[PDB]
Write a protein that binds this ligand. Structure first.
Ligand SMILES: O=C(O)C1=C[C@H](O)[C@@H](OS(=O)(=O)O)[C@H](O[C@H]2[C@H](O)[C@@H](NS(=O)(=O)O)[C@@H](O[C@H]3[C@H](O)[C@@H](OS(=O)(=O)O)[C@H](O[C@H]4[C@H](O)[C@@H](NS(=O)(=O)O)[C@@H](O[C@H]5[C@H](O)[C@@H](OS(=O)(=O)O)[C@H](O[C@H]6[C@H](O)[C@@H](NS(=O)(=O)O)[C@@H](O)O[C@@H]6COS(=O)(=O)O)O[C@H]5C(=O)O)O[C@@H]4COS(=O)(=O)O)O[C@H]3C(=O)O)O[C@@H]2COS(=O)(=O)O)O1
Length: 124
């Protein structure tokens, strides 16, 4: 398990028990602890431990969490330079998981491979 800390603003990814996704700064938040499970090399589903919900990306780029697994709940995890990680949707293949600088998430339909918003340094 671990926390994903976004390089764009220093916000940790957070999955609430209601299915709401956002980024926090409080590093002791219980909702940022996540669990990543591999569906084989490169693919992973991300799960918010407490909430018990999986991060899912919708077709309009919005980000949210679902009690159950769906094709919108798997991401290609790629290790970048300096150890930052990026999560791209296995279904909306050119869309990444990302947070803006204000802390709120950023529509996957406005992301890209060289954005600071998609970078996450994982912290146990
Ligand atoms: O609505 C839109 O669609 C939209 C799109 C348009 O872009 C724009 O529309 S327009 O009409 O105005 O044209 C507008 O953009 C807004 C963004 O959508 C919004 N994005 S967000 O995700 O919601 O937050 C927001 O963007 C801010 C974000 O931080 C970020 O956006 S993102 O998409 O990339 O994620 C972006 O960050 C900039 C950063 O501010 C720049 N810094 S600088 O001071 O201007 O130079 C720049 O950072 C670069 C440095 O240039 C680079 O310097 S160097 O010369 O290359 O060395 C430095 O590099 C680091 C390197 O990262 C380190 N690597 S590490 O160790 O592995 O970590 C290390 O090597 O050290 C290097 C040196 O760092 S040092 O300075 O400390 O010495 O840092 C990088 C860096 O990324 O940090 O560029 C980034 C991103 O690249 S780019 O997009 O500029 O090309 O932009 C932020 C921002 O500009 O505020 O706000 C946008 C503005 O909208 S608004 O304010 O007008 O409303 O909307």
């Amino acid at each position: 398990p671990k926390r994903l800390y976004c390089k764009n603003g220093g916000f940790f990814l957070r999955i609430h028990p209601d299915g709401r996704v956002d980024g926090v700064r409080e590093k002791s938040d219980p909702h940022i602890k996540l669990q990543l499970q591999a569906e084989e090399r490169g693919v992973v589903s991300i799960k918010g431990v407490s909430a018990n919900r999986y991060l899912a990306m919708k077709e309009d780029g919005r980000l949210l969490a679902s009690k159950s697994v769906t094709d919108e709940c798997f991401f290609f995890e790629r290790l970048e330079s300096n150890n930052y990680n990026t999560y791209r949707s296995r279904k909306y293949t050119s869309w990444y998981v990302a947070l803006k600088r204000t802390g709120q998430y950023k529509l996957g339909s406005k992301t890209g491979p060289g954005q600071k918003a998609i970078l996450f340094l994982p912290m146990s």
